[PDB]
Design a binder for this molecule. Structure first.
Ligand SMILES: Nc1nc2c(ncn2[C@@H]2O[C@H](COP(=O)(O)OP(=O)(O)NP(=O)(O)O)[C@@H](O)[C@H]2O)c(=O)[nH]1
Ligand SMILES: [Mg+2]
Length: 155
């Protein structure tokens, strides 16, 4: 079977761990336990293909096959600093064509300081898809992770 190595990156507190745990455990973590380094695995079916998701949850290397670049829509600075994570990845992989998805998390909150059109423009300049998610309501979570898997497939 095929295994997909996915790496979730982004600033602190944007919800990387809540996202990974919502996908894997179908459970929203209310608390904020800072991550130093964590790894999760789960067999899922994607487009009729049984595959193993291996997800590295990082704190706010070269083995990552795809990357979720996460900011929070109510955290302007986390969006302003996403370019640092993209460029870090681009450095390590030594490729301008790295499977990647731009994720705007916490889309259930009404305190939105990052406009969707702004994130769409950024994603477009990166040549990657933009997906808004909520680890709480599960909106867009499957969309984000599975879209990243499909981006790995096209590569
Ligand atoms: N309402 C809402 N709250 C969220 C969402 N995602 C995360 N949170 C909340 O925001 C906080 C941050 O969660 P967390 O996932 O740990 O962030 P993180 O990016 O992994 N932090 P670190 O880099 O420190 O490991 C938590 O209290 C969590 O409950 C979301 O989609 N909606
Ligand atoms: Mg975390």
């Amino acid at each position: 079977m095929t295994e997909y190595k996915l790496v979730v990156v982004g600033a602190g507190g944007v919800g990387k761990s809540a996202l990974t745990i919502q996908l894997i455990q179908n459970h929203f973590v209310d608390e904020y336990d800072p991550t130093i380094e964590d790894s999760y695995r789960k067999q899922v079916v994607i487009d009729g293909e049984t595959c193993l998701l291996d997800i590295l949850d990082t704190a706010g290397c070269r083995t990552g096959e795809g990357f979720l670049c996460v900011f929070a829509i109510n955290n302007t600075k986390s969006f302003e600093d996403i370019h640092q994570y993209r460029e870090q990845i681009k450095r390590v992989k030594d490729s301008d064509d790295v499977p990647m998805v731009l994720v705007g998390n916490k889309c259930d909150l009404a305190a939105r300081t990052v406009e969707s059109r702004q994130a769409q423009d950024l994603a477009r300049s990166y040549g990657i898809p933009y997906i808004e998610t909520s680890a709480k309501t599960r909106q867009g979570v499957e969309d984000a992770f599975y879209t990243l898997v499909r981006e790995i497939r096209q590569h």
